A = this chain, B = another copy of it.
Amino acid sequence: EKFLVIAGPCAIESEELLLKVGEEIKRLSEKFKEVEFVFKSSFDKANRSSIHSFRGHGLEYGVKALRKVKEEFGLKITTDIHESWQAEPVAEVADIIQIPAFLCRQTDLLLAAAKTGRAVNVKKGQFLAPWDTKNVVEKLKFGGAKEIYLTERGTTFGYNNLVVDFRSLPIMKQWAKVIYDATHSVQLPGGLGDKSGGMREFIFPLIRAAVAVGCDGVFMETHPEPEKALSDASTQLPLSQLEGIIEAILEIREVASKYYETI
């Protein structure tokens, strides 16, 4: 089956940043034809730790910026919603509607996404056990979703730290396609006080583990200059490193694939 790579800047800092990343993602999609690329970027960071942190330029601007990316590069789009009313307008551009991790149990939000007819990708809550995603998928199916994804992004492990329990990949695979979030799984929740931390040195090895265990895709936040990002500056992957990372997981996926268990 076609491997999915969801990537893009964490936040829509501007329509310019988007076109810049989109240009590179378009180039890679032409090279890695066995991969289905989906451009990602949040029109709003509605759950920052600090009131003083960057949130975004609003739904309107964001959707417009995303529509430009899709229009200019012919790339599929995904973005997250935070309240029910946003599902309708977002669905006009987003091929995949993403549900934030803290909101994976909010029934109305899930239902709002499902009735759009668009694919839905739920970030697994840091508080959720892998077997408890079965009910999340059931809610979506009840709401009309026909294409559902569950994203692994780490689990609460003591304070300000997340651990990735790779047993979750084969467990969740029982009810939906599984995506591994390579960048948020290494972030340190509220690590820097007013903001969260992260250890970029573990992004690559954990992503190798993910494809070796077996998943249907990977999620990676990338930025031309991470150190200047308005969000996830500690975890966003340098855009120049994207191609190499993708080639690597495709290679590991291929060699490991024959051993993937039948779920």
Q: Which residues of A contact B (CB under 8 A)?
A: 46-51, 55, 82-84, 102-103, 105-108, 125-132, 135, 138-139, 142-143, 155-161, 163-167, 169-170, 186, 189-190, 193-194, 199, 201-202, 204-206, 208-214, 248, 251-252, 254-256, 258-259, 261
CA distance A49 to B139 in the complex (A): 9
Q: Are B156 and A199 in contact (CB under 8 A)?
A: no
The 6 closest A-B pairs by CB, nearest first: A158-B158, A212-B212, A129-B159, A209-B209, A156-B156, A132-B190
**28 contacting pairs across A/B (C-beta < 8 A):** A46-B108, A51-B107, A82-B106, A83-B83, A102-B103, A102-B106, A103-B106, A128-B189, A130-B159, A157-B157, A159-B161, A164-B165, A164-B166, A166-B166, A166-B206, A166-B209, A167-B199, A167-B202, A167-B206, A170-B201, A205-B213, A205-B261, A206-B213, A208-B209, A208-B213, A208-B256, A209-B209, A254-B255
Contact of A156 among B126, B139, B210 (CB under 8 A): B126
Minimum C-beta distance from A57 to chain B (A)? 15
CA distance A82 to B204 in the complex (A): 37
CA distance A50 to B209 in the complex (A): 32
List chain B residues, Cβ under 8 A from A214. 205, 208
User: How many of these chains are in the complex?
Assistant: 4
Q: Are A135 and B83 in contact (CB under 8 A)?
A: no
Minimum C-beta distance from A235 to chain B (A)? 14
CA distance A126 to B155 in the complex (A): 11
Chain B residue with minimal CB distance to A194? B135
Contact of A204 among B125, B165, B261 (CB under 8 A): B261
List chain B residues, Cβ under 8 A from A84. 83
